[PDB]
Every structure is written in structure tokens, then in C-alpha cells.
Design a protein around this ligand. Structure first.
Ligand SMILES: CO[C@H]1CN(CC(=O)Nc2ccc(-n3ccccc3=O)cc2F)C[C@@H]1NC(=O)c1ccc(Cl)s1
Ligand SMILES: [Ca+2]
Ligand code: NA
Lengths: 52, 233
């Protein structure tokens, strides 16, 4: 796909790689099985407001 | 911060405040991990001895959750100079790791190419600090936050009496009375992308605060992502 269209449907980082989109996540998150979503590995992942 | 609003609870948890000997804040910083704080290189000349406060939103009143952390190693960009204010970035390693908690948590470092094409192309970013609330006013005891438009490089250069480098960007308003100010230096400029906030700027400098036809000048973090990386390992 393209990263310039809805961020390749990634939650975080997007890169174009062989005519297709590859998503990735910041440290403290692991890429979902769906290859789009970023799942935090602990209670205070970076860049998330502490609302709860 | 001139204009803007106080951060609501948990809204600005990556904010660190640098405090001199007299326990007074004089610069901000951004929490990057349990051991590291990002700040401005130019802040390290405005005090020899300083510490790092986190979890604070109201300096006058002490709450449940604030903490002070001593500085272990100061890592200052080797190319910063007061002459030019270029390479205006430093990292600090604390003596004791932060415990993340309400109002205390790190901002994310983005991947560079994605940040360039995706974060720096947003309409606006967020800057935050306990700095002066007017050019000639006092610092705020409440932590404030402010949305600032990204401002085009050419326009910024024209507006400016000092050289803007590729390690700087401009953000803020032409005449609207909102900006960062003395005391916010070193603090966070972050950009929100789908509910996650990524470090994009470091409050760096400005001619006065919120002056008409002058913008806020921020260190361009994307130039320094590898540098911050090396500094933290
Ligand atoms: C009243 O508060 C003001 C007073 N200012 C004092 C000051 O020295 N500002 C400057 C700092 C650096 C520079 N500068 C930039 C490039 C090359 C040489 C050089 O000297 C100019 C300043 F005016 C700094 C302070 N303003 C700010 O910190 C900011 C305003 C908007 C942002 Cl973002 S930081
Ligand atoms: Ca307090
Ligand atoms: Na202005």
C-alpha cells in the first residue's frame, strides 16, 4: 500500500517495503499479529497520557 | 508558556523540570526512559548544580507524586555554542531511575523518516512548561501546555534576526499572544499521532516571548535521533 494513505493503516511507524507497507512500533510496544496495531508491554508505555 | 492552559491531570506526564540550587525551576526537559532526560544544551550554563523534578504540575503546592532525581552524567552535544545556539540538545542520565506513575511517564522517540513525513507535516504540536506566563512576568507554579502551529522555514527565516539552522524549526503564531518563554527552555515539544505523543522539538529560543512577528524556535529532534540513541546506550 502507501504510507501516505491513512498511514498504511499502521498505529505508529509506517514504511514502504517492496510495493507494500510494513508497520512498526516504538520501544515498549509490540506489533500486533495483524501487522498494524501497537500493543503496549506495560502500564506506562511512552507517549501515552496517564488518564486511567 | 504564554497563553495556553494548565495541563489537566495526566495530560503532560513526560514533563521534567530542572531545578537550581535554590530549588527553583529554570528550564524544562522531557523524560525519555527511566534513566534519561532530554533537554537544551544551553540550559547547562544557567546553573552549575541542578536536579531533575518530575511528576510536578504545581510548584507552589506540593502533592502526592512528585520526586527529585539527581543527575549522574550530563551528555551535551559537542557542537553546541551560545554563539549560534545550533546543536541545542543534551541528554541527562539520572542517578536513580524514575518510577513511572500518574503524571510521570516518557514521550516516544519516533523513527526519523516517518517523523519527517508524518509528524512534522501535522498542523500543530504541543509545548509545555512552568516558564514565564508573559515575556516580563513570573514563572507559573502550574504546569501549562500550548498548541503551536508548525511554521514554514522560509517564513521563519524572514521573521528572524538570528540565523535559523537545519537543526532548528519554528512554531507558534505571528501576532497571537501564545508562545513558550524563559523557563520553558529544554522542555517538550511533542506531536500527537493517533493518541500517542512523540518527541519532535526541544524548546530552544525566541526573541522575547510571543512578540509580534517572531516565532518560537525549537531544536529539530529528527536531526538528532541517532545522537540521542547513542547517548542513551
Ligand atoms: C523573556 O524570555 C526570553 C528572553 N530570551 C533571552 C535570549 O537570549 N533569547 C535568545 C536566545 C538565543 C538567541 N540566538 C539564536 C541564534 C543565534 C544566536 C543567538 O543568540 C537569540 C535570543 F534572542 C529567551 C527567552 N525566550 C524563550 O526562551 C523562548 C520563546 C519561545 C521559545 Cl520556543 S523559547
Ligand atoms: Ca506540586
Ligand atoms: Na509572535
Amino acid at each position: 500500500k502507501l504510507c501516505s494513505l491513512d498511514n498504511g493503516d499502521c498505529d505508529q511507524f509506517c514504511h514502504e517495503e517492496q510495493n507494500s507497507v510494513v508497520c512498526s512500533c516504538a520501544r515498549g510496544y509490540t506489533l500486533a499479529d495483524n501487522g498494524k496495531a501497537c500493543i503496549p508491554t506495560g502500564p506506562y508505555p511512552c507517549g501515552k497520557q496517564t488518564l486511567e | 508558556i504564554v497563553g495556553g492552559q494548565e495541563c489537566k491531570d495526566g495530560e503532560c506526564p513526560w514533563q521534567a523540570l530542572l531545578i537550581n540550587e535554590e530549588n527553583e525551576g529554570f528550564c524544562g526537559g522531557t523524560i525519555l526512559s527511566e534513566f534519561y532526560i532530554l533537554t537544551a544544551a544551553h540550559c547547562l550554563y544557567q546553573a552549575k548544580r541542578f536536579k531533575v523534578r518530575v511528576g510536578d504540575r504545581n510548584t507552589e503546592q506540593e502533592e502526592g507524586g512528585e520526586a527529585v532525581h539527581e543527575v549522574e552524567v550530563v551528555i551535551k552535544h559537542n557542537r553546541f555554542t551560545k554563539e549560534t545556539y545550533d546543536f541545542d540538545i543534551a541528554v541527562l542520565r539520572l542517578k536513580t531511575p524514575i518510577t513511572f506513575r500518574m503524571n510521570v511517564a516518557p514521550a516516544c522517540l519516533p523513527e526519523r523518516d516517518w517523523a519527517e513525513s508524518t509528524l512534522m507535516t501535522q498542523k500543530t504540536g504541543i509545548v509545555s512548561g512552568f516558564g514565564r506566563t508573559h515575556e516580563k512576568g513570573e514563572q507559573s507554579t502550574r504546569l501549562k501546555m500550548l498548541e503551536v502551529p508548525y511554521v514554514d522555514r522560509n517564513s521563519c527565516k524572514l521573521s528572524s534576526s538570528f540565523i535559523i539552522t537545519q537543526n532548528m524549526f519554528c512554531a507558534g503564531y505571528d501576532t497571537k499572544q501564545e508562545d513558550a518563554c524563559q523557563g520553558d527552555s529544554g522542555g517538550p515539544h511533542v506531536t500527537r499521532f493517533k493518541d500517542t505523543y512523540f518527541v519532535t522539538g526541544i524548546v530552544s529560543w525566541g526573541e522575547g516571548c510571543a512578540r509580534k512577528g517572531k516565532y518560537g524556535i525549537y531544536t529539530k529532534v529528527t536531526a538528532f535521533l541517532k545522537w540521542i540513541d547513542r547517548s542513551m546506550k
